[PDB]
C-alpha cells in the first residue's frame, strides 16, 4: 500500500532518495516543529549557499522551491547536493576513516600489490560483503589509483612485520604520513564524491541533527519515535517509500523543469532559476 518512488542511480541514490522523502515531510508540514532547530537552519544555510537565486533565505521560500520543482528528478537536482554539502559538515573523524581504508587495502592485498595487479583485480570486499575502501576506489584510476599501487609497492618493501591488520595500521601511521595527507587532499576535493556509493550511517550525524531516522529495508527500531524516511535497497540501489496519500499531494505535481546532469548539479556551475 506504500508506493516505491524510484530514485536515480548516479552513485548518490542515498542522497537522491533521502531528498525525495525529506521533501514530502517538509511539504506535508510534519517537520514544521523542527524548522528552527540548529540542524535545519544549517540546512537552510547550505540550501542558500548552493542556489544563488534562492531568496529570501527562509523555510517559506525553500518550501516554494520544492513545490515548483515538484518532479522527483528536479527535487533530486536541487536538494541532493544540498544534503551532500550539509553531510560534509558532520564528518568529525575523517583522517581516521582514510587510515582504515588504506590499511584494509594493504592488509587484504599485500601480495596483490607487490605482484603488480591492476586495481580492478584487487580484493575490495570483505567476508561479510562490506566495502573495504570505497573512498579510494572512487578516485581517478590514471591520476590517483594506479600511482597509489606504485608507491605502496615501494613502501611495503620495508614491511618486515607479520600480516595482521593491527601491524598494517601501526605501520601506515609511521611510514606513510605524507601519503595519507596526500589522499586526504584528493578525497576531500574529489569532484565525483557523490558517485562513491553510500551507507545510511555515513549520514547519521546529519540525519540525527535533522531529527530524522533512516529505516533500511523495513528494519525499524520501534523505540525510535522520530519522523522516518523509509528507504529500500535491492540491487545496491537506494529507493524511497512514500504513502499514496502523500505522493499524490507532494510529489510529481509538475512536469520536469530542469535539464542538467547530476554532475552539473553538485558542482553548482549551472544555476537553478528562482520559481515562476
Amino acid at each position: 500500500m506504500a508506493k516505491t518512488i524510484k530514485a536515480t542511480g548516479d552513485g548518490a541514490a542515498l542522497f537522491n532518495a533521502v531528498s525525495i522523502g525529506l521533501s514530502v515531510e517538509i511539504l506535508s508540514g510534519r517537520l514544521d516543529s523542527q524548522l528552527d532547530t540548529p540542524g535545519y537552519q544549517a540546512l537552510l544555510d547550505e540550501f542558500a549557499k548552493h542556489h544563488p537565486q534562492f531568496n529570501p533565505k527562509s523555510w517559506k521560500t525553500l518550501k516554494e522551491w520544492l513545490a515548483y520543482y515538484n518532479d522527483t528528478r528536479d527535487i533530486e537536482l536541487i536538494l541532493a547536493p544540498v544534503l551532500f554539502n550539509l553531510n560534509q559538515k558532520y564528518q568529525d573523524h575523517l583522517d581516521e576513516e582514510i587510515l582504515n581504508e588504506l590499511t584494509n587495502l594493504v592488509w587484504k592485498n599485500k601480495a596483490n600489490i607487490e605482484n603488480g595487479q591492476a586495481w580492478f583485480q584487487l580484493q575490495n570486499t570483505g567476508d561479510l560483503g562490506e566495502a573495504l575502501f570505497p573512498k579510494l576506489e572512487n578516485l581517478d584510476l590514471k591520476k590517483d589509483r594506479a600511482p597509489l599501487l606504485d608507491k605502496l609497492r615501494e613502501i611495503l618493501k620495508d614491511y618486515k612485520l607479520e600480516l595482521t591488520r593491527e601491524n598494517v595500521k601501526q605501520f601506515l601511521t609511521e611510514k606513510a604520513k605524507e601519503l595519507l595527507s596526500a589522499l586526504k587532499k584528493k578525497i576531500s576535493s574529489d569532484p565525483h564524491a557523490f558517485q562513491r556509493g553510500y551507507s545510511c550511517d555515513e549520514l547519521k550525524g546529519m540525519t540525527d541533527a535533522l531529527a530524522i531516522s533512516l529505516v533500511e529495508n523495513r528494519e525499524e527500531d520501534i523505540t525510535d519515535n522520530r519522523i522516518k524516511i523509509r528507504l529500500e535497497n535491492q540491487e545496491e540501489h537506494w529507493n524511497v517509500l512514500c504513502n499514496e496519500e502523500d505522493s499524490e499531494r507532494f510529489l510529481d505535481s509538475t512536469p520536469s523543469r530542469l535539464k542538467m546532469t547530476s554532475l552539473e548539479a553538485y558542482r553548482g556551475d549551472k544555476q537553478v532559476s528562482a520559481p515562476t
Binding site: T8, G9, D10, G11, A12, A118, W119, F120, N124, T125, A131, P134, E137, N138, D140, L141, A146, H192, Q195, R196, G197, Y198, E235, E236, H237, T261, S262, L263
Partner: protein, 75 residues
Amino acid sequence: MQIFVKTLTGKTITLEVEPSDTIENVKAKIQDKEGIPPDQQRLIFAGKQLEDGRTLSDYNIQKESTLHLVLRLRG
C-alpha cells in the same frame, strides 16, 4: 546522453553515450576509466544480460539508466 554503470560496491561511474552505441563499444568506455578488459565485464540491465552485438536502444536503455557491472572472474 549520460548513463550510469554501478558496481557491486555501489560505486557508480558516468558514461557519455549515444543510443546507437553497441554494448561492445560500451565496455570499451568502461575499460578506459577502470582498466577492465571487455571480455572480463558482464553488464546486466534489469536482469537482462547485455551482449556485445546489440545496441543500447535494443535494450531500451535511455538517459540516466543505470547498468550493473560484474566481473566474469569474480562473479
